[PDB]
Subunit: 444 residues, 3 copies
């Protein structure tokens, strides 16, 4: 929607504003249960295609129960020792293993299929019964299987049993190939009917309920399913859903690109790049910063992010966009001598860093070339433009309409004397390049 | 096939030549459609296993339509702001949302199952009808379901309806777990029969058609499926297939490994590594360079790559393989003091960098050890050799026959005086280490 | 189980001990085979729902055979040219293509479903026959399909044929979407019954057999399935299972975090971080080091790792934990001026690096805040603590009981004069910062 973008010619960066936050800060857990029956041996002469057919669909059942039994018996550096995403789920699994805890769940779901249960560790969980394979196998099936002559009446029972068993096998293969933990949340793990029902009874605001149920596909991508326990005629697993404790605060995206002096010969040029690119959202008097790509998902002008993937910075960090030389926040940059041509596709446009003999242009599919980029760091709005070419590579601009603004100014690389420029700083900042230069100039 | 490899003792690198390019430069889009019926409520007393069985298979149908409805309502740093792979597909989705555009498609496919359609934005698309669930549900099914007493005749209709519905549910779960965009291209999204049919009618050369239909498995790995629209008794989604606009130009792979001085004691040695490893293909008077691992897939002597993942370099870049000190291209290297033993498996052999007390050897499973590597950077051909051991780690050489060549020369690390060697350059080059040394030598 | 952890206040690191190794060093291969029939055209008038229903399930069969036919016709930098994980499998595929080699397998499995076969390249393989689609289609099905009038008797045969065909289609779609190589090992590729049977007949110790069959889910995550050959009425593919040649040696995990001087103003502080974090296991007189995250999977106090992902270091490397200034191993560190607050979740606790105005605390869900962290690098045990907060981010401590130990000492960053501190070392070491300082101090 109302999205705007500013490009800063001086620092070769661009900021996309107009977005609104939805940052995960809490976790909600609920317990999904399937009712099982513990059928062992069925003394039955078979060979009759119909009996042999239902015995092998019964074999799939015992194989999945067994497979589940085998599961239950057992700036980016700053984000590596982050811990387990599923701790609050695992906390619920520990409790279901306590004696009689599964028994509490069964009795709560004996009369209905959805009930609130107070667990023994203080968390109040919503519990669902999504499949009753127990009373199907015990009632509408097992009597036929417990006389020495076993003759199923009609093939309809073979098909009815495959349909009942089917969801259990879909749930088991997902846990199998994923060591008991799956994300995103399958429709098989939680159907849309059950997920909206769950969201509606969450201890959250009507604001958060309406945000979640308008983007169920995003809630799935940020939820986990955890295989839990399989005892006492019950299968249970924990669904872990996000809670967006930060809502509707301003978010902005920083795009950066290498800024270099413009001599055509390679290596005789000094470069400089802002390293603080990523997503920024205001969050409790500070700024939550998301440096990693694909840790935030955009929908129109709403940003969903998980604060587990963020760093906290002082809110002054945004001063680097408007005044990189400011004395309130030391803005972070890297330096090099690698003048390779490249383009960054922003929200409402494109940044192009053209160096050497490279051919960099911006085109319209019907009109031809609309801008030929000179050497240096320039910018184009996505209005009237479909593609950007850089060397032999074709980039596609985004086609969303917004307000673009070009803030002219001198490239700050021009302020630096190349004879005393620290030209291989992996992770520095503005005043760290200044104090490194102040040493060299005093050596003279 | 005719593959050759050169190892350069002087720069501890190896080049595998003999390959031929297939670089994606264009995108082809076609519209796949499934015909739907908009059945809401069926007033039917059931309970009879057969009727209740077909009502729940009908429930799966409405659940998938709903799930699709929920989707439609809504050197490596130089490759991060690259944009959307699926822009030209999304451009086609925007058009199908225009009024009457889906109506154009329906009428084109009313008489046949494959037809060319001219869309309203100028792109001529090939359109497929792969499933007609409309006329099945409306004709061979719904009459039975619209009298107050509903009795399906035979179980065959329950099974026939599951088979018809089945592909729709397979397509919907893939879009569900992937937020409406999937890659590689499922056989469920596009069968081999439909994909070869599509390739045969593409606006491309008989050369490109024969290349694509000889490697359908690779075309799948480089294609996208995009969920699009679900209105007016039609489901439609866009398949986006690659176009290889660069074909049969020479490609070569650069393998690099750390080159260091050979004192056994750790840290008292200086190291130096070429950083320009990856794939290189000639491309329109320049060289397309693929620095990222797994962005190129090899089949015999053919390299498939996506130019979206490349950088453009001057063709002079290959001079670094034969003369790293050349004055036409500043060859890029890094420096360190980290002499850790390691091996690189090349196309037709292995590079071994052996330092310290490490045991590095090359073996034959029947003959024993064939080469024991001294300290420094050495190389072995894959003829008569199965494995390379480095410390406690076993590497397996590739078993393809080719021409190996060993270019003797002095390790360039020996040319550098260690007392004035910039020994922690993250991203430098030959003449940047030279000018950094020229400063230190004048300080004296 | 008996897990202990030490935190070193001086170097801002923590070591989790008590673990025991299971490192993959060998590969076992076996050949799984499905018996096929090469049915081409069946001259049959149909239209009868039952015949048309079995003809399309027969179509799925030929489509999967075709799809398989299309497949058969065709510190972290030190780990990039590692080679192919599946070399020893591919070596077995080459042999099955030799003339009469598939014929050897068929005759070995003509009388039973599991047999040892001696291949022509010297490897003795265990061979399984998991599905006999040949004699089903040829005997219990094809006679009905080879008179001009084709009338299937009962719908039971349609369902029986779907069940037989079903596993073949599950195997084919996995190979399809994965270019003939899949990991982890599907239950569809190898059932739990077949996998335990295979492990029991492996040429390995009763120790290794009991370790593997107690963790089948881990064996799956470290195994590969390779599509191989489809000729002469046989489908065959190779399963490649790990062999743990290193068992029960001590493993320990190193956790590191940035250590910095504690002035609140940003950038005027020098930092220093140990870069050697990861897993370490004793291995044949040396130490196997696993720098990459998620290349080791933990179960209670057992560590499963693949030595293909490791480096070999001298066993002296562990001296850095107890004496970072030691003269036997040059301990590796990086330096910067980036004092951003962050926390590392260790095995039995949490490391917190608190800098600037950031609010860093450790909480109990019932008691409130239990520790407020001062500026600098501190540590908390997981006893009585559930969460750690750093700025706006909530981290969850692990809830396993163990022995924690806090080794007090002075932060080594305090030993360095900031006026001559090389404050942007990407990959250095203790004595490399010393010799870099010795130059600056002599310049004076």
């Amino acid at each position: 929607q109302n999205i705007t973008e500013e490009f800063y010619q001086s620092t070769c960066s661009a900021v996309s504003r107009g977005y609104f936050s939805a940052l995960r800060t809490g976790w909600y857990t609920s317990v999904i249960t399937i009712e099982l029956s513990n059928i062992k041996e069925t003394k039955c002469n078979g060979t009759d295609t119909k009996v042999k057919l239902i015995k092998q669909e019964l074999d799939k059942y015992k194989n999945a129960v067994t497979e589940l039994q085998l599961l239950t018996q057992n700036f980016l550096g700053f984000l590596l020792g982050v811990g387990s995403a599923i701790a609050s789920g695992i906390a619920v699994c520990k409790v279901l293993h306590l004696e009689g805890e599964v028994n509490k769940i069964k009795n709560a779901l004996l009369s209905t299929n959805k009930a609130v249960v107070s667990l023994s560790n203080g968390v109040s969980v919503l519990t669902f019964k999504v499949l009753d394979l127990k009373s199907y196998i015990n009632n509408q099936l097992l009597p036929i299987l417990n006389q020495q002559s076993c003759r199923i009446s009609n093939i309809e029972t073979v098909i009815e049993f495959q349909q009942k068993n089917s969801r259990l096998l879909e749930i088991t293969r997902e846990f199998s190939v994923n060591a008991g933990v799956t994300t995103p949340l399958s429709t098989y793990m939680l159907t849309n009917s059950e997920l909206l029902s769950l969201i509606n009874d969450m201890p959250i605001t009507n604001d958060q309920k309406k945000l979640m149920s308008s983007n169920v596909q995003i809630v799935r991508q940020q939820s986990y399913s955890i295989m839990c326990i399989i005892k006492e005629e019950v299968l249970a697993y924990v669904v872990q859903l996000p809670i967006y404790g930060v809502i509707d605060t301003p978010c902005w995206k920083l795009h950066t690109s290498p800024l270099c002096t413009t001599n055509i010969k390679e290596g005789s040029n000094i470069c400089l790049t802002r390293t603080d690119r990523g997503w920024y959202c205001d969050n409790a008097g500070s700024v939550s910063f998301f440096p990693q790509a694909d840790t935030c998902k955009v929908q129109s002008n709403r940003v969903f992010c998980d604060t587990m993937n963020s760093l906290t910075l002082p809110s002054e960090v945004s001063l680097c966009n408007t005044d990189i030389f400011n004395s309130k926040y030391d803005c972070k940059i890297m330096t090099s001598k690698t003048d390779i041509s490249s383009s960054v596709i922003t929200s409402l446009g494109a940044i192009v860093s053209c160096y050497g003999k490279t051919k960099c242009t911006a085109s319209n599919k019907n009109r031809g070339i609309i801008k030929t980029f000179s050497n240096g760091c320039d910018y184009v709005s996505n209005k009237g433009v479909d593609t950007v070419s850089v060397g032999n590579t074709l980039y596609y601009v985004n086609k969303l309409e917004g307000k673009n603004l070009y803030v002219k100014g001198e490239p700050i690389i021009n302020y630096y004397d190349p004879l005393v420029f620290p030209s291989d700083e992996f992770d520095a900042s503005i005043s760290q390049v200044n104090e490194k230069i102040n040493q060299s100039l005093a050596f003279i």
